[PDB]
Amino acid sequence: HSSPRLFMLSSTSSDALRQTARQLATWVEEHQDCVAASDLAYTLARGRAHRPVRTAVVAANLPELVEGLREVADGDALYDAAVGHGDRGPVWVFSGQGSQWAAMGTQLLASEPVFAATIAKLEPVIAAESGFSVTEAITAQQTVTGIDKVQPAVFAVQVALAATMEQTYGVRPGAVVGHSMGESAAAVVAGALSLEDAARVICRRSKLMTRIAGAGAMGSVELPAKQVNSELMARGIDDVVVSVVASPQSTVIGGTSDTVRDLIARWEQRDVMAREVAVDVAFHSPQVDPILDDLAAALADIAPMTPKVPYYSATLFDPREQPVCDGAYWVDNLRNTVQFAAAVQAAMEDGYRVFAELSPHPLLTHAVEQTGRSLDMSVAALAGMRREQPLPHGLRGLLTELHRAGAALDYSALYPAGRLVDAPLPAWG
Structure with a gap:
């Protein structure tokens, strides 16, 4: 029961999250002798509807949590908002x-x-x-x-x-x-x-x-695959092909060792970010x-x-x-x-x-x-x-x-059981 716990805290903005941290610290400080750390951690995670701007304070005891909460409340950190709406898994x-x-x-x-x-x-x-x-x-x-x-x-x-x-x-x-x-x-x-x-x-x-092992090489270039293929065709290259299409702007070529290294050297000379990839085999190629x-x-x-x-x-x-x-x-x-x-x-x-x-x-x-x-x-x-x-x-x-x-995520895996404590509920804003 004196092991470190994760206390979740969330709000609608970085300033409102600091206000909620200060309001909670004052409450925890006043009721520390009445509240179990396990119950408060359970309440914050399973008894609160998580808001867009989130954080969590790690603490082994309630006075340690009041320090962490007050540290958040006094600071000037920018808390990024959640990009997911808790409806889909990762x-x-x-x-x-x-x-x-x-x-x-x-x-x-x-x-x-x-x-x-x-x-x-x-x-x-x-x-x-x-x-x-x-x-x-x-x-x-x-x-x-x-x-x-x-x-x-x-x-x-x-x-x-x-x-x-x-x-x-x-x-x-x-x-x-x-x-x-x-x-x-x-x-x-x-x-x-x-x-x-x-x-x-x-x-x-x-x-x-x-x-x-040893047959061929690979290279990453910050050019789209359609452009890379156009360059290979234009240069009459058949020993090197597009092996990976990583992003709309990034491509990995693969093929014979010399032609791959030649192409990387040429791309770097045109101020195009290109790097040889460490490989034994040129995969996703002939x-x-x-x-x-x-x-x-x-x-x-x-x-x-x-x-x-x-x-x-x-x-x-x-x-x-x-x-x-x-x-x-x-x-x-x-x-x-x-x-x-x-x-x-x-x-x-x-x-x-x-x-x-x-x-x-x-x-x-x-x-x-x-x-x-x-x-x-x-x-x-x-x-x-x-x-x-x-x-x-x-x-x-x-x-x-x-x-x-x-x-x-399933909050009952990390917080399997406890009591809903009458911790503060910040206003809807």
């Missing part, structure tokens, strides 16, 4: 490779039991399929390397993050969007594949890709053609299911179409262009405004923001975790940011 974004960092899973294995349980389920599957310990990989002092180790390790973090958010924090996703290998975690979370079949997909596909028949054969036993959650496909030519996640889908997922911008745009057109990337480090937050900006919409693109970020209280911070942003 859209989980599952990015590709490149998010991995050394001992990325250590703090979450200790602080989040559902993260540890999910990693325990995957441990024997990844061991049987890829021949390594995923727990050793995500807790080692050196970052996981080798496509056959990276993909199962990043997928394992992605799925353990989503299970923790739903099981511990009562956050059911409104929709899922995957990018490249991110689609295996998107399929588990959407109910299209079982945890095990999705692990099999990511294990098998990464083992086959080791055969073509470089992956040799291993596609073997992949189809490896995934012939994978059992797809009808998605239970809206699944915005970056593989299909219509993201609103619901995937049949069979072996053919995973072959197309590796070979076809990642139509990530089209998938994000479809979700935004359908009303989703809160996006959270469940990955070891954010790779597609800027892409999501760029699509929102193009549609003239106010969206939130959150990061589930960041490289070397302390997580002493697990994912409680991400829950707070989802709440502040206006994502629909």
Whole structure:
């Protein structure tokens, strides 16, 4: 009962939120000997209709909360308004490779039991399929390397993050969007594949890709894909193609190593933001053609299911179409262009405004923001975790940011029981 709690506080403006903080601090200070911290936290979260401008104060005791509330009330912070209306859940974004960092899973294995349980389920599957310990990989002092180790390790973090958010924090996703290998975690979370079949997909596909390691390169350019394709055709280039369409202004090309690096050098000379992407294989190009028949054969036993959650496909030519996640889908997922911008745009057109990337480090937050900006919409693109970020209280911070942003969530998961206290009710203004 003397453990730190999250006290939610909301209003219609930053000034009104400070007035509510001051009014609450005066009340808590006067009634601290009568009110239990658990009851007041329960009342603020489940007994109040959350207003547009939100915040939360963390405190282990009522005098600590009066300090935090008075700190808010005295300050001059600008509290951003929620972009969601609490009607739709968050859209989980599952990015590709490149998010991995050394001992990325250590703090979450200790602080989040559902993260540890999910990693325990995957441990024997990844061991049987890829021949390594995923727990050793995500807790080692050196970052996981080798496509056959990276993909199962990043997928394992992605799925353990989503299970923790739903099981511990009562956050059911409104929709899922995957990018490249991110689609295996998107399929588990959407109910299209079982945890095990999705692990099999990511294990098998990464083992086959080791055969073509070193063949080709990739590059990111801040130009729309129609423009990039026009330039490739104009220059007579057939060895480099558009591999990813990330945003209405961003494109990833892939193909032979020299031509990709030549194009990046040329774009930078025209003051166009261009960067080589660190890759062993040039995916979503003809470089992956040799291993596609073997992949189809490896995934012939994978059992797809009808998605239970809206699944915005970056593989299909219509993201609103619901995937049949069979072996053919995973072959197309590796070979076809990642139509990530089209998938994000479809979700935004359908009303989703809160996006959270469940990955070891954010790779597609800027892409999501760029699509929102193009549609003239106010969206939130959150990061589930960041490289070397302390997580002493697990994912409680991400829950707070989802709440502040206006994502629909089950408040009875974080505040399961308590008493409605006669705490002040600020006027409607």
